Amino acid sequence: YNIADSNIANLGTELEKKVKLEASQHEDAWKGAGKQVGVEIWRIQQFKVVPVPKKHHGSFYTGDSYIVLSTYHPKTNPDKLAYDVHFWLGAFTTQDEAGTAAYKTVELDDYLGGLPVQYREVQGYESERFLSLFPKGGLRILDGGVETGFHHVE
Amino acid sequence: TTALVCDNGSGLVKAGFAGDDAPRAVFPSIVGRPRHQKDSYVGDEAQSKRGILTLKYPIEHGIITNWDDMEKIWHHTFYNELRVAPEEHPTLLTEAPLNPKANREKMTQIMFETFNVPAMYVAIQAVLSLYASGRTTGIVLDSGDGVTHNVPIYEGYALPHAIMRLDLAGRDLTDYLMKILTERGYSFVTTAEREIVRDIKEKLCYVALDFENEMATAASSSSLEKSYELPDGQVITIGNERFRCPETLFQPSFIGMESAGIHETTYNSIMKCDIDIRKDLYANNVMSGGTTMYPGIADRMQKEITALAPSTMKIKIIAPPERKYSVWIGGSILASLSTFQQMWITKQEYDEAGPSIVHRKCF
Ligand SMILES: Nc1ncnc2c1ncn2[C@@H]1O[C@H](COP(=O)(O)OP(=O)(O)NP(=O)(O)O)[C@@H](O)[C@H]1O
């Protein structure tokens, strides 16, 4: 059409990125994230981004969705940080959990200046990069999960 | 505080509360007035009194063309259907991409000045559908009653240069079915009869995998025919109209449009994107909207995109079972997130900035 006359004229702009960067400042889970090499994990629990304790990293409930931030030193500079952000969707996760995980992955990407590369990791379809995150025997799938945040309309 | 989510379709209002898994109010986006020229009826009740009313849709091809009647739709949604006081609820609205900017300016003005909402946002429909599918990268084909649109999205950002839109969707298919049914000697002409034919279309139409083969099957015997009982009790029979009607999506020349069909708009949109992301788009074609509900449409799309794409390209069509409501559901999810609501226009911001603020906050 005529993009400039339309409701998509401001998509792709610095302004869009500025507004979304500001929104990402309002999520407590990102404070302090991505500050050293390692793996940080959160689980969606009734729309909220909830940290997973380090002792459980690599264990994922099949009924749930998660965000996994892998911070590493890039080849270009051994003293700087780069990021892969994986969102892991269990075989039995509900639509609210997977949609929140997707949205919040974009938000964490925004928070980190766009630098993270995103990976969608469905249970049984995990990428080679995701399989490489956990030490041998570290990746384990657990039965069950937390309850959906949706109210079911009868 | 609970947000309202209202997906104002050209054909159907889908409305409800953020955090619910489905819209609690789904009804025709119509105002009816006496066919013989209180004074008007809205939604289901207009449909119920169709026998004596002329029905009008305030939205045509995704754009509000009768603002007075649209205000009646919104008033009905808040006060008669959901039975809420709009001044108590932040409200998420939706729009097709490539609408003229004035459409959302006036949406914003009416929501704040007439309905006194405390905050609001206008989202692009395809983005909500992609999140409803649990993805940040993919290409959405959304087709409702008024608009068919393609939006490729990468890492959560829609790619505006690659967005495609066709003002050909379910209402045009209903009108075409009305036309071709005259070949059998049937006459469907009035606004009330349009709604009957819409029902025939929804119940009996399908997309043929091979259109020319299907035409030959329909002439060889009656194996594809179905009957349908009209509200007056007359029982009609339809045959190849079942699949000629939605064939228009693939061949818009059936209604005199020179446009590319939906398989070609999808391919063309992918081809406007950077080469290195195209494999991810081809593998993540997400369908949303009522006009994507024809039996056979996903298989036909798979076949047609395969014929256009490089011979080794891995292609996948995702057709969620609740895709009549995927836009709404994505809105319910996002409107449940405090950070998404942080971007909403507040009543104070509107008071100070006016309608232009919508372009600076809603992406
Ligand atoms: N099973 C079905 N088969 C074919 N068409 C259908 C089916 N169910 C609904 N439709 C059509 O889908 C349209 C309504 O879908 P919907 O997605 O609610 O559109 P909308 O959002 O109101 N319009 P738009 O402004 O284009 O997004 C109408 O044309 C219906 O007749």
Ligand SMILES: [Ca+2]
């Ligand atoms: Ca769960």
Ligand SMILES: [Ca+2]
């Ligand atoms: Ca990124």
Ligand SMILES: [Mg+2]
């Ligand atoms: Mg729609």
